């Protein structure tokens, strides 16, 4: 994922 928090 390009960012954190995507699960």
């Amino acid at each position, epitope marked *: *994922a*390009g*960012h*954190a*928090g*995507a*699960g």
Partner: antibody, heavy 117, light 114 residues
Framework: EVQLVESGGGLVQPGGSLRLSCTAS????????FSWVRQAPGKGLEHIGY???????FYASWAKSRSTITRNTNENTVTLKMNSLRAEDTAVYYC???????????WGQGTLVTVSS | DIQMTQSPSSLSASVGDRVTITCRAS????????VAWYQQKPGKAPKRLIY???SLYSGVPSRFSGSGSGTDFTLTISSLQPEDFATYYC?????????????FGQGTKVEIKR
């Protein structure tokens, strides 16, 4: 062409609440993750929280008990609500896709919220 | 408690000077890639100059370059212009699949000598 237009701001009594909204133009608010950031007068930038494209809101520890960051897909908006405001919460508030790792970055113009009796 | 510290916190330089700003993070950023450099004029929304450590967005002057790795980042201005007075911020993205943060350096104020 693409824009993030911020609306709200002004004077709030201590213990009151703020509600700030940003309207996206040129893109869909639910396609990306958006942060709210603030800057107290003469101070540095401070991250308030991040609403992922997946719809999960991660708040800074200092902000979590008082803050909510939500989005409205029909109106194409993202909104910050904060309650129990104190003088120390006086600051310019910005909505922003920070773009630390991706091509797309965009910020609202910022709006000053003053907390005072 | 994620910390980003810039060196120096303020500096003065003349037009044409080469200027360097360092930022160090207390832990590595997301994917060892998610760091941006921002430029803020007082009162105005910050403008992004560099993303993903070293990528220059279209329209950003070529005198700005970014470099570094995971925890130590550098903004270089090869030849300062008068319009480059501003506060410069390093911005990092951090976390895991189920936790997400951003952090800001404290800012480096750049004033122009003449």
């Amino acid at each position: 062409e693409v824009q993030l237009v911020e609306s709200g701001g002004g004077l709030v009594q201590p213990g009151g609440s703020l509600r700030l909204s940003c309207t996206a133009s040129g893109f869909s608010i639910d396609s990306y993750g958006f942060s709210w950031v603030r800057q107290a007068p003469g101070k540095g930038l401070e991250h308030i929280g991040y609403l992922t494209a997946g719809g999960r809101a991660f708040y800074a520890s200092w902000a979590k008990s008082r803050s909510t960051i939500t989005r409205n897909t029909n109106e194409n908006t993202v909104t910050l609500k904060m309650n129990s405001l104190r003088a120390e919460d006086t600051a310019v508030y910005y909505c922003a896709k920070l773009g630390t790792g991706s091509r797309f970055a965009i910020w609202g113009q910022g709006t000053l919220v003053t907390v005072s009796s | 408690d994620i910390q980003m510290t810039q060196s120096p916190s303020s500096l003065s330089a003349s037009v044409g000077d080469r200027v360097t700003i360092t930022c160090r993070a207390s832990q590595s950023v997301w994917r060892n890639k998610n760091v941006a450099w921002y430029q803020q004029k007082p009162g105005k929304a910050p403008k992004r100059l560099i993303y993903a450590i070293a990528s220059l967005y279209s329209g950003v002057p070529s005198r700005f370059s970014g470099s570094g790795s995971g925890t130590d980042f550098t903004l270089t201005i090869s030849s300062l212009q008068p319009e480059d007075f501003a506060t410069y911020y390093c911005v990092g993205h951090y976390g895991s699949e189920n936790d997400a943060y951003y952090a800001f350096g404290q800012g480096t104020k750049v004033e122009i000598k003449r």
